A = this chain, B = another copy of it.
Amino acid sequence: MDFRIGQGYDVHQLVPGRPLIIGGVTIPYERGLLGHSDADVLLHAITDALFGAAALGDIGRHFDSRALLRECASRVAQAGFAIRNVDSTIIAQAPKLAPHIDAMRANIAADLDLPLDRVNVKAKTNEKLGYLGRGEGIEAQAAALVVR
């Protein structure tokens, strides 16, 4: 089978008092992510992993973040690929993300037209290390498997 893998990375600064939107979920918090778009680091990492798996370049080259993810999926399908699964990790010292993971997974699954059982989102802190551990930013990592 013509399987392909992709990987994505994104990070943004946390600044006052933008909305904190991750995986399409607005999370109550005193700061939010800084970017030209809504700065949804998780959706950006996933988008990059998908463009990467399909050898379609990157988010910079191509481009709210859910609309961008739906367009990415469209472009991946246009190239003849089907998405098999996505896995991801968010690294944030605060706030607590566990209560929001299920809604993120639902949003992603809806945007990629996947069943829930093919989408995973994990949450981590950075153990108080570095800019992530000081709460200066939030990072996301993603992996995607597609097939032509």
Listed in ascending order, the chain A residues whose CB lies under 8 Å from chain B are: 1-13, 34-35, 48-49, 51-61, 84-85, 87-89, 91, 98, 101, 116-120, 122-124, 126-131, 136-137, 141-145
Nearest CB on B from A128, distance (A) = 7
Q: Is the CB of B120 within 8 A of A57?
A: yes
**What copy number does this chain have within its complex?**
3
Query: In the bound complex, what is the Cα–Cα distance between A5 and B131 (angstroms)?
Result: 28
Q: Is the CB of B5 within 8 A of A57?
A: no
With A1-B1, A48-B122 already in contact, the answer to whether A91 and B61 are too (CB < 8 A) is no
Residue of B nearest to A12 (CB): B127
Q: Is the CB of B1 within 8 A of A141?
A: no
